[PDB]
């Protein structure tokens, strides 16, 4: 009854993971930029849908935030799981979970769905930004379950072009505002279409704060 629906192709590829990657690539763009004193995650989104109800950017913990590109429901599930794991770490050790370890645990949970039987892979890619005693981190988690460490990245439509833009405008030692301005420029390559979160505890910018930028 329980058997893998993700199988090695004759060439050694896992075509379900490739298809989930295609789905994520056909999803709305999100990106992250790590500035010398912070890290920011930005994303882009009919006169009826309430904006406040469909945040893509969410708060994993006091100093950890997450954004996604892919399937909203899978994201909700994985967000609840990441919050649960952060809380479990806090209960065990009495301190906020480190960004790298949370990324590793979520990566393991994502990989589990590429191997266990009777489950499709998560159809999303995650950008997790956080600050710990070891600085600021911006990690990307793939549908496959592999996690990359980034200074800056984009994970949606035309992400080749957006990666090129970030590379041509990104500098190692930059301030937060300079990064936010680069982030907004990358996404536009309106204010109602922008959601930004900055790392004080992780914060998500209000409508006015986006507008004045």
């Amino acid at each position: 009854y329980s058997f893998s629906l993700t199988t090695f192709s004759p060439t050694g590829k896992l075509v379900q993971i490739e298809y989930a990657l295609n789905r994520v690539s056909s999803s709305s763009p999100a990106l992250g930029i790590r500035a010398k004193n912070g890290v920011i995650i930005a994303t882009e989104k009919n006169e009826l849908i309430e904006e406040n109800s469909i945040f893509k950017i969410q708060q994993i913990s006091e100093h950890i935030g997450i954004v996604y590109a892919g399937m909203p429901g899978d994201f909700r599930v994985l967000l609840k799981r990441a919050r649960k794991e952060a809380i479990r770490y806090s209960l065990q050790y009495g301190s906020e979970i480190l960004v790298k370890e949370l990324v590793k645990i979520i990566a393991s949970i994502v990989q589990e769905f590429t191997q266990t039987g009777g489950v499709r892979p998560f159809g999303l890619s995650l950008l997790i930004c956080g600050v710990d005693v070891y600085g600021y981190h911006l990690y990307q988690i793939d549908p496959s379950g592999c996690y990359f460490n980034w200074m800056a990245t984009c994970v949606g439509k035309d992400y080749q072009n957006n990666m090129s833009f970030l590379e041509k405008r990104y500098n190692k030692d930059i301030e937060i505002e300079d990064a936010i301005h680069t982030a907004i420029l990358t996404l536009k390559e309106n204010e109602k279409n922008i959601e930004i979160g900055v790392a004080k505890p992780f914060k998500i910018l209000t409508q006015n704060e986006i507008k004045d930028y």
Binding site: Y1, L5, Q16, Y19, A20, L21, N22, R23, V24, S25, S26, N46, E47, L48, I49, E50, N52, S53, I54, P72, G73, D74, R76, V77, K80, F113, G118, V119, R120, P121, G123
Partner: protein, 232 residues
């Protein structure tokens, strides 16, 4: 066999989700939820999902708790199953936390459950879409909508027809007067969307309001009065 299971296709889509959405659309049942300043209204058709039949018993509106209500459109078995799952989640939330769940939490939990279906290949998708309305702790109405895909979103007005609601709301832009105006808005919205004259006995309207939080359905006499007021 790529489109049979809840697995990805070469393009990355989950075609079973789209098929369940088409199943929901096939029922030819329309339901409309409208938010007011201190009130929310849900109006549904009183027809069955596609003579001696009891027409009173036919309904697409259900009561999850005293103060939270829903309209479920889809395959009737799936609709009843989702209603029962929502009621179980509400009772569990009340027991475990000691206060009444609000519509947002209920919609998000229901969508987590829907996602479990959409991912585990051994279960079939519920061809059920839902509106949930209630009054949250901040004394404002909540009106959320979810589909078979597991996507939930809050709305000022939703249908399970967008430009009609847009025009009506931008036209609109006392507590009893607010309730009455939103009810007129919902009835007119359904009449517009359906594009035919409504019968007071073929449509069900329910409201939640700060004056009376309890999700209640208004009698057919009041609906008849509202219908008469329109066109006059």
């Amino acid at each position: 066999y790529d489109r049979h299971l809840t697995i990805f296709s070469p393009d990355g889509n989950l075609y079973q989700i789209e098929y369940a959405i088409k199943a929901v659309k096939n029922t030819n049942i329309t339901s409309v939820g409208v938010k007011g300043e201190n009130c929310a209204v849900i109006i549904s058709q009183k027809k069955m999902a596609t003579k001696l039949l009891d027409y009173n018993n036919i309904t697409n509106i259900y009561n999850i708790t005293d103060e939270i209500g829903c309209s479920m459109v889809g395959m009737p078995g799936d609709c009843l199953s989702m209603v029962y799952k929502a009621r179980s989640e509400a009772s569990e939330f009340l027991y475990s936390n000691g206060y009444n769940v609000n519509a947002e939490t209920l919609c998000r939990n229901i969508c987590d459950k829907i996602q479990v279906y959409t991912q585990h290949a051994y279960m079939r998708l519920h061809a059920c879409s839902g509106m949930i309305i209630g009054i949250d702790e901040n004394n404002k109405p909540e009106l959320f909508k979810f589909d078979p895909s597991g996507f939930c979103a809050g709305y000022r007005a939703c249908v399970i027809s967008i430009s009609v609601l847009e025009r009506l709301l931008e036209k609109r832009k006392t507590i009893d007067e607010d309730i009455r105006n939103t009810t007129i808005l919902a009835i007119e919205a359904l009449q517009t969307i359906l594009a035919f004259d409504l019968k007071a006995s073929e449509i069900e309207v329910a409201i939640v309001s700060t004056k009376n939080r309890n999700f209640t359905q208004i009698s057919e006499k009041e609906i008849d009065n509202y219908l008469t007021y329109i066109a006059e």
